Structure 1
Amino acid sequence: SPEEQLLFLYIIYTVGYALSFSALVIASAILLGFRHLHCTRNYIHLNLFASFILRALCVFFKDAALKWLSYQDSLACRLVFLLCQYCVAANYYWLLVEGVYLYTLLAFNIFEMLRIDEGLRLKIYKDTEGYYTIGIGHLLTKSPSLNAAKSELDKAIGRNTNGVITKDEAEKLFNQDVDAAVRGILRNAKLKPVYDSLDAVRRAALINMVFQMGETGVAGFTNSLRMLQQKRWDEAAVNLAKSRWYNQTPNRAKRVITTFRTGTWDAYSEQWIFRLYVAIGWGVPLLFVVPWGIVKYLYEDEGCWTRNSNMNYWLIIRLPILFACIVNFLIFVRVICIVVSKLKANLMCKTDIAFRLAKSTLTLIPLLCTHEVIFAFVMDRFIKLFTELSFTSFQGLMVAILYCFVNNEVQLEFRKSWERWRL
């Protein structure tokens, strides 16, 4: 029947945005509601959900405003359709920073953590305690003798030091110290059980302390290392603040303790980086959606700009979205090479936030950007093509499921709050 076919496609489209809107408002309420979920990774998801919530709001408003000059001729419709096209562009750019963040998350490690904290030295320096340090936090001997410190370093590097040591020589000795730091942990009976229970991100936080203090020094935190193994982060966080290490070096401790508490690199992140993501997700769409709106209102103004068949005014909204998808598939290919490299080299497990985030972000890129690339320069079997409306409606639900409902961290917050109710 012609009426039943046109009516059935309306149901699967409206229940699509109904299930999406609901799940996205629930998912956003979960990320804001639970205190331990307030991290950069989840704030980026909230801005992505916001673009799918406002897209659904345009869909529900268009449907509601049909209830009584026709709606196609009204200026209010054109504003709703402009707001709709702004949300579509925002979906593809909040998906872009979603891929950008993932890539930067795979690149940051212990070698970049310690390079920020320990810094870099070109010449041998007599440190405040009495030790001679050089490169990236490489101590030699406490003996007050520069002549013996240079002869000690010469045996460690190979060639004659003289004093000045290049960038490549410091990085070579820095890899040795980190390898000497992990062997110390695994050789220690009080550090190996907590290290093997910690995730790759909080493992680096434990290595960072051994790199500054030593295997026998951090082993003294018998009260703190026990509650880290028992997965009690915040109880250990306030415990490490009441230590000799926190009053000695507070700025370094604040960054290491946050990594044990949160399990992310946010204490090594810059606040202007997130300002550059909000300028990409909401700002860049605003640069090509308003000129498209201006030229469609001043020239191709006909039924909420439905008759989109005239000139290049169609490319000034499809090429910037195509560009966002081309770069998303480039990031897609590169991240897959990084993840498979880090998994085979045993530098990553399938239980880390970087691999879990890769299982969701690398799913959505060819799920939201594949259509735009296949039908790149095509404007306009009809029953089989109308099935596109179901994937455009339930894609809001899919973003909510992959970035919240399947997340292992939110499942911990529900299981923890559930136990708090009983006890």
Structure 2
Amino acid sequence: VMTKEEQIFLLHRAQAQCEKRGRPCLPEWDHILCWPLGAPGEVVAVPCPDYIYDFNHKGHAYRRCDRNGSWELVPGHNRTWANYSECVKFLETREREVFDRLAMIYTVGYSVSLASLTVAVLILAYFRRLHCTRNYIHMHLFLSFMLRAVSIFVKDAVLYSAGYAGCRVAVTFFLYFLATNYYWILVEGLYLHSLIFMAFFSEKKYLWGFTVFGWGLPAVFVAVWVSVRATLANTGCWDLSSGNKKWIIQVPILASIVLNFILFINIVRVLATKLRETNTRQQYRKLLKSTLVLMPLFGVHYIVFMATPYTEVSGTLWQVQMHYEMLFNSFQGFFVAIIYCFCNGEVQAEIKKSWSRWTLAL
């Protein structure tokens, strides 16, 4: 496949050969293609040009001149009669419809998550009781979800509305905000693993280290990707993929999912062990409930389609993957906010006390 720029370039090269170039009928064909001759009063019989992208090259133009070498003109006063109408019987509504469908699904899902997460961030910030290293990372994770969503909206606005600076800025921010959200999920998983499996903690050091890892490292990967893109291709917007360089950002994000998945299984192991030590159907119920609540936090749903390479759009696997990810990824923030802020016992108790005191004072 070749892009619009290539077609513009190839056409210029095509017309260049036109310049470097019954009766023969002389050039009586067009001003775009470059078979400048009408053949000796016969059907031109030139195959459909292969320099055009698809054009069903196996076909023929079947241009003709007659009488004794003259074109057959003025049917309804038309001129330069041509026969390649059957050659252009080739090649989109289906792809656009599903693209729009995916757009509406994740836009709605992201919107609800933003509203839920914003209420969650405000709740955690206002109450001083909830201020804790666990809650600081939760606020960082909740925020990262917000910047991820708003940037996607910003990217959609720029794209829907040619290598301008604003287009690049929107794309790079979207990737950086996507990466930080993924790593902050890993940070939460790593933080939980450290708590359970380590007998000593240093909040002053680990908290800052986790914050730097969550924020700084994705920026480095975006920075190196931006530097590579600018100094290697630097063609139009970065919306298109020029090759394997996309793996600069994709691979580290995927590397995080497996590590988080491994930690998730390990965390389930200790849950299955401790409940076994304290005793049954109830134990299974708690373990299953504990697994479900922790699933959205650890991003377990990402593992289903982690290792899938680029599949063609017109395929069942591609369709199910996009619907699956664009639904759960969008609503992951909403689920996390519900479980860990709205359903949190401490938050509920804190809200109840403040409301009761405010009502009593009023």
Give yes or no for contact 2:258–2:303 (8 Å, CA) kept in 1.
Answer: no
C-alpha distance 4-314 of structure 1, shift in aligned 2 (>3 A): closer
Deviation at 1:359, TM superposition (A): 5.3
Distance 2:231 2:276 in 1: 57
Root mean square deviation, CA, Å: 3.0
Q: Which residue of 2 aligns with 1:421?
A: 358
Give yes or no for contact 1:300–1:310 (8 Å, CA) kept in 2.
Answer: no
The structure with the larger Rg is: 2
Q: Which residue of 2 aligns with 1:294?
A: 227
Q: Which residue of 2 aligns with 1:394?
A: 331
- Report the number of matched residues: 257
TM-score by length of 2: 0.63
Distance 1:54 1:363 in 2: 18
Q: Quick check: 27-36 or 99-108, which moved more?
A: 99-108
C-alpha distance 269-292 of structure 1, shift in aligned 2 (>3 A): same
Q: Which residue of 2 aligns with 1:324?
A: 256
> Among residues 110, 128, 132, which one is paired with 1:35 in the alignment?
128
Identify, as 1 or 2, the structure richer in helix: 1
> Among residues 289, 302, 305, which one is paired with 2:238 in the alignment?
305
Distance 1:306 1:40 in 2: 38
* Structure 1 residues 402-413: aligned runs within 5 Å: 402-413=339-350
Q: Which residue of 1 aligns with 2:77?
A: none
Matched, 1:339 2:276: no
Q: Which has the higher contact order (CA 8 A, sep 6+)?
A: 1
Distance 2:342 2:291 in 1: 16
Distance 1:6 1:319 in 2: 25
The unaligned stretches of length 5 or more in structure 2 are 1-92
2:303 partner letter? T
SS of 2:238's partner is coil
Distance 2:257 2:321 in 1: 21
Q: Percent identity?
A: 39
Deviation at 1:383, TM superposition (A): 4.4
The unaligned stretches of length 5 or more in structure 1 are 117-267
* Structure 1 residues 240-319: aligned runs within 5 Å: 269-311=202-244, 313-319=245-251
Q: Which residue of 2 aligns with 1:78?
A: 168
Distance 2:329 2:251 in 1: 19
Distance 1:399 1:417 in 2: 24
Deviation at 1:98, TM superposition (A): 0.6
Distance 1:319 1:271 in 2: 31
Give yes or no for contact 1:325–1:372 (8 Å, CA) kept in 2.
Answer: no
1:345 partner letter? E
2:278 partner letter? N
Distance 2:266 2:222 in 1: 29
TM-score by length of 1: 0.54
C-alpha distance 12-308 of structure 1, shift in aligned 2 (>3 A): same
Distance 2:176 2:250 in 1: 12
For residues 118-145 of structure 1, the C-alpha deviation after alignment (integer angstroms, 9 at most, x for no partner) is xxxxxxxxxxxxxxxxxxxxxxxxxxxx
Distance 1:297 1:86 in 2: 16
Distance 1:308 1:66 in 2: 15
